[PDB]
Amino acid sequence: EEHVIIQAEFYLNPDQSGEFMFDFDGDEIFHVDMAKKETVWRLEEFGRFASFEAQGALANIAVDKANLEIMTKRSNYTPITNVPPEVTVLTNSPVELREPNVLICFIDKFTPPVVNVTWLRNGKPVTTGVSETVFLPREDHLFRKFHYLPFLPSTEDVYDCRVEHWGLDEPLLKHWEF
Amino acid sequence: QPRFLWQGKYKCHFFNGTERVQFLERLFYNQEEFVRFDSDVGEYRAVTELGRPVAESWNSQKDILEDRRGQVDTVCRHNYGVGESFTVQRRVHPEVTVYPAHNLLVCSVSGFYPGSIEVRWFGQEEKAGVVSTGLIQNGDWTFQTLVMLETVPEVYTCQVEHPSVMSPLTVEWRAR
């Protein structure tokens, strides 16, 4: 084993939602935004060295939708057994008072690929400079997902990642303190 | 409301570049793998009962098998060349810092790529009692790791060896 490239695609009914991404050694190279018909490189610089026609991924997902609709009939409309996520709030580097940092909410080991992730500072939700990955593949064929919050560490602020999933009896809220 | 999920995974496994390559296609319904095409076998094989007539139909078609058998060259080997410079050949310098965490000395190694790294504690280096949190993937093409030391306790030095840095990086520590 030297290098592994995985092309991971999915389609989900009745949500009618599909995704397509490339994974290199556990990292995302790119994904295709189905709504924008756009190739989105994980690092902007990747689009300077390589290209991908987003149209091909959309035609792939149409085939996934047709095949899913056939397989749903063949199983006699049997549904996914929901697996709830285990979620973790951490930093990418050692935390320093008043030194710019990024809080990362890691939502792991869940299915179907549908979540409602919210960041809150002192209770109030925050959407400033926030970013997120797509539904990333796992080897146990469950999903993982990263949510990011750029922040200026303080001794007074309190942070939380609230995640809503259908496998959870109660919405998960993971607390973070300096 | 009921949900139905399809998953398609097309894996290109490279063993020493484009010398030995395998293509593995696996299809999933509601998380369960039902059928798969392994290039080492050259035909579709069922995993569960639903994949039995699925593999039966595709394998009976010469055109389908020739397309799937050529994936190693047309997609796998082609994509290795396209992404080689920014993935296989990607090198980002580690950021090394030492701090204490009772006595337990921490060596924080951050923002490095690729994952392959040598982290040694040193006068003579200590091999026993150097617990690690393991290699942590940040999900953004960087890695981070913390390599501890069950010490009592002298200057302690963390030595880091990585394919990005030409000379071994070192960080010394002393308490006051």
């Binding site: 390589a50 991908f52 | 994936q71």
Partner: peptide
């Protein structure tokens, strides 16, 4: 330069 992909196979002919 162009990244390629594996195409999914159709299970039925409609």
């Amino acid at each position: 330069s162009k990244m390629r992909m594996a195409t999914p196979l159709l299970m039925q002919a409609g």
